[PDB]
Design a protein around this ligand. Sequence first.
Ligand SMILES: Cc1cc2nc3c(=O)[nH]c(=O)nc-3n(C[C@H](O)[C@H](O)[C@H](O)COP(=O)(O)OP(=O)(O)OC[C@H]3O[C@@H](n4cnc5c(N)ncnc54)[C@H](O)[C@@H]3O)c2cc1C
Ligand SMILES: Cc1cc2nc3c(=O)[nH]c(=O)nc-3n(C[C@H](O)[C@H](O)[C@H](O)COP(=O)(O)OP(=O)(O)OC[C@H]3O[C@@H](n4cnc5c(N)ncnc54)[C@H](O)[C@@H]3O)c2cc1C
Length: 428
Amino acid sequence: MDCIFIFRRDLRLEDNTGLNYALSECDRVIPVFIADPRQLINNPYKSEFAVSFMINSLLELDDELRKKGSRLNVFFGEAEKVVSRFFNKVDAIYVNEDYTPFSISRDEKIRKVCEENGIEFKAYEDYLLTPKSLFHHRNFTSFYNEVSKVKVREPETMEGSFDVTDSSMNVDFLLTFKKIESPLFRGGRREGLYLLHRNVDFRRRDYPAENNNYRLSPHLKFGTISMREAYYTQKGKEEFVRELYWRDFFTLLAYYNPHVFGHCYRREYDNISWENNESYFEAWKEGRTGYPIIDAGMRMLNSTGYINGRVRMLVAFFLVKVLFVDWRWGERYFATKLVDYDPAINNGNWQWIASTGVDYMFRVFNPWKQQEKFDPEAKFIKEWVEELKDVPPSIIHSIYKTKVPGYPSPIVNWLERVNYVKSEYKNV
Ligand SMILES: Cc1cc2nc3c(=O)[nH]c(=O)nc-3n(C[C@H](O)[C@H](O)[C@H](O)COP(=O)(O)OP(=O)(O)OC[C@H]3O[C@@H](n4cnc5c(N)ncnc54)[C@H](O)[C@@H]3O)c2cc1C
Ligand SMILES: Cc1cc2nc3c(=O)[nH]c(=O)nc-3n(C[C@H](O)[C@H](O)[C@H](O)COP(=O)(O)OP(=O)(O)OC[C@H]3O[C@@H](n4cnc5c(N)ncnc54)[C@H](O)[C@@H]3O)c2cc1C
């Protein structure tokens, strides 16, 4: 048959489930990418960094296609409407299903349009490491132990034929949306594999100053490499593989509990009276809070669109349990900066930290203790907080006692706040 494959979040030609079936089931396959205005224009949850990474990855994907006497066929508009106008005469349409409300309804509409035109619509599982039917767990540890026993499908690629549509635009069109690139990523599968092979001490992955994180999230989220590939390449590293499974967990959690997008996983907490002091929130986004480690984190994130998991949760903790600001505010702000923004993964993590999610205990961290343990030399802090650039570490770790020039002193006492926020939770 003459069919179409629509890329979305699986920006690669290797080990792409839906693409594989498409290549083996039809004679010619037209590789398509649809620039959707609901995602690229006036998206409150849009990240400029994430977009650049996607565009760059889309540019790289286009090269791989040209090396096969084809090219990426680009269209513009809402997915369902695009299919409707341009593909009404194609045989079938292949894709990889996703798990968010937006994605689910978008595919339902494409399905309707497909039935009323005689186009076969085939969606396949690809983003997850495990089959979705296998989910039915309260917490992560329960999930991992049960599902990790299952065998991960091995990467594979089918041979086929890539065709083109003269009408369609080409990747050049997408350059309008690439406005500001992360100095820390370049996108594409080639960079992805390079990162996948750096040998780091994952053991010390908590220390920001060190370089022990693979920085693979954006590549996994946008699919320059498959979940299965990351898995087999690192199969021997238990720590990394278990963390890889956290992606599946949060995705599936959201898939089976759509209400997380807008409400608390544990609904009762939808009654918390967030102080939401717009003033503190503004200080948090600018990294002008009085805590060095928190300031360093936000500042890095702002200019880079990335921060390791340790800083990520310290920052999230501080906004929710110390400045007492609704986690949804932080969720949205992050969605705005993360080069690796993933709706379900971002949501899952925020709720976890705000303890309105999968973690049922009311977890608390000591900013100063934390700061001093994971950045003993204050190297990370000095790298991102301009003003403390020359203050000796010893002082920085106690900067609440002093008051260096140009650096605001703590905007609140975390201890008193955390106690109040908790009482407010128990109150509920
Ligand atoms: C900034 C960005 C732009 C992208 N543009 C395209 C594109 O043009 N074409 C394409 O095929 N794929 C695009 N992608 C890839 C996208 O991840 C896949 O298309 C995916 O299948 C779509 O579902 P999503 O939930 O990730 O949509 P996303 O782009 O995250 O979001 C789509 C819609 O959901 C809203 N939304 C996102 N997060 C939240 C939240 N936490 N709470 C409430 N609402 C939220 C957005 O505002 C928008 O209205 C883009 C991804 C990002 C992060
Ligand atoms: C408040 C908060 C928001 C977050 N938002 C996102 C997000 O929007 N998109 C996203 O991809 N990750 C998010 N995470 C998870 C995690 O921080 C990032 O995946 C990680 O920092 C990416 O950098 P890395 O690849 O170097 O991770 P490293 O530790 O090198 O690699 C570990 C890998 O395991 C997985 N992983 C590790 N921690 C988590 C986690 N907590 N949740 C899910 N998967 C994990 C990822 O594949 C990650 O690449 C968030 C975490 C927190 C606490």
